[PDB]
Amino acid sequence: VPNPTMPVKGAGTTLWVYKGSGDPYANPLSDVDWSRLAKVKDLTPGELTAESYDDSYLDDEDADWTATGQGQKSAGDTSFTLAWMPGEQGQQALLAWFNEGDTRAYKIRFPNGTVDVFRGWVSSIGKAVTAKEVITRTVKVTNVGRPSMAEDRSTVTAATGMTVTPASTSVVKGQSTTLTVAFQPEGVTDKSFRAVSADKTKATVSVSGMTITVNGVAAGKVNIPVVSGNGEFAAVAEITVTAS
Amino acid sequence: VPNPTMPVKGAGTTLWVYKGSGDPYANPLSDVDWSRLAKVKDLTPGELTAESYDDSYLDDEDADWTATGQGQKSAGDTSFTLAWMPGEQGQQALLAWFNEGDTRAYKIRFPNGTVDVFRGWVSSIGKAVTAKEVITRTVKVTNVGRPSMAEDRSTVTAATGMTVTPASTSVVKGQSTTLTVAFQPEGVTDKSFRAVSADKTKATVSVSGMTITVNGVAAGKVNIPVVSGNGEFAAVAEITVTAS
Numbered sequence A, B: 001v002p003n004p005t006m007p008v009k010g011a012g013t014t015l016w017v018y019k020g021s022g023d024p025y026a027n028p029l030s031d032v033d034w035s036r037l038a039k040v041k042d043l044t045p046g047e048l049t050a051e052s053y054d055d056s057y058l059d060d061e062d063a064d065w066t067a068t069g070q071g072q073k074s075a076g077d078t079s080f081t082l083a084w085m086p087g088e089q090g091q092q093a094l095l096a097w098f099n100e101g102d103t104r105a106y107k108i109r110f111p112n113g114t115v116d117v118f119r120g121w122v123s124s125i126g127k128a129v130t131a132k133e134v135i136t137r138t139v140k141v142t143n144v145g146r147p148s149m150a151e152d153r154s155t156v157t158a159a160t161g162m163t164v165t166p167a168s169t170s171v172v173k174g175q176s177t178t179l180t181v182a183f184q185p186e187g188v189t190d191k192s193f194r195a196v197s198a199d200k201t202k203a204t205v206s207v208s209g210m211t212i213t214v215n216g217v218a219a220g221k222v223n224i225p226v227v228s229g230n231g232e233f234a235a236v237a238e239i240t241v242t243a244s
Helices: A092-099 B091-099
Strands: A014-018 A034-036 A040-044 A052-054 A068-070 A078-083 A104-109 A115-128 A136-143 A163-165 A176-182 A193-195 A204-208 A211-215 A220-228 A233-241 B014-018 B034-036 B040-044 B052-054 B068-070 B078-083 B104-109 B115-128 B136-143 B163-165 B176-182 B204-208 B211-215 B220-228 B233-241
Touching: A014 A040, A014 A092, A078 A115, A092 A115, A163 A233, A176 A233, A193 A204, A211 A220, B014 B040, B014 B091, B078 B115, B091 B115, B163 B233, B176 B220, B176 B233, B211 B220
Parallel strands: none
Antiparallel strands: A014 A034, A014 A104, A040 A078, A052 A068, A078 A136, A104 A115, A115 A136, A163 A176, A176 A211, A193 A220, A204 A211, A220 A233, B014 B034, B014 B104, B040 B078, B052 B068, B078 B136, B104 B115, B115 B136, B163 B176, B176 B211, B204 B211, B220 B233
């Protein structure tokens, strides 16, 4: 249904702020570590510009027509107003973003399946209070550096398939077992995953670089659920733990 | 028979115009100086309107129901239509009223002995021509200021009494006598009067503030009439003027 080669109606556009660590430009399709800014009244994305550089010399035969070239670009000034919910995360995190000069990353997700991720710092936080109208919070973010348009991530293989094969063997205290995940639907993929223990007590799990290590902290039958990327697919694995 | 505490049938309503100086609001009942607009086909009197004003503040607790108050009143635009008699004295006065921005006073007399007095300027003058139907003149008056409704007056003592005490003696050239009129039908009165001269040769009367000065311009025997208000009561006195 989402066709990036046909015009879209705009409704359904979403705003997120990168609350994790690492490279936000790498895999922006996944929603992991992206806190959502809900209840957006209106949005005005930044306009990439370019300064004009004068490229005229004295020797240049004839000067009837001006000659110029491109200069510095300076993507900047993405603004948006949302509803005022002072006691909800994403909005408190927004005020925290304002209170230091942090240059954080933020992404805009469009209904046609494409993403536009920028990186900037908050330069304005306002508020409009009138009767018979919901109080709105207005934000403005000055963008720094080169952004990441949706015209760069034009590959998208869409995945649509994965499997999780665990060891499913008893693990003794202090020893780490390795779990396997196949995320190769014809090889090319553009998604990640995260696995989190369903009890957090009988075992400790760690997922890093396609390496899933599970340690049998306490005896029993631990269940490790894994969810891929934003959460299109998921799986459940079991690992026994023996007291001996 | 006219009972202002019971509904009336509406037949017998009359239209009058105040073609004089003074306060029409003072004694509307007295038809003195009021010119009648006879042959009224129909009449739609003005509507006492009142604008709305918003009395809502931001700090007001709750706004579920609107809070409003009275604003400006602007009562006017009473219309009527009558038979078209261009050569009639009273319709030429109406055309003169239209032809300048004069804001004159007019009154409507109702069959139950009550009067509504408005003051305004003529805003629409028209005609309707059709065979088998009397040609009609249509008028519309935009009222200004506060009217004097029939509900403002509630006492009306009805008078029912007046007499005259004249000098009824000789008058010398260059010396004027005083004629007095008693208008005390048990104290309270709501009517004025006027006096005339029969010949305008032997003597003439100056009338103002109940004071009537009769001066014998020429010798002889003259009669001075007095008429109170619309003509309900009258009186006649005799004054003699001597040559020496």
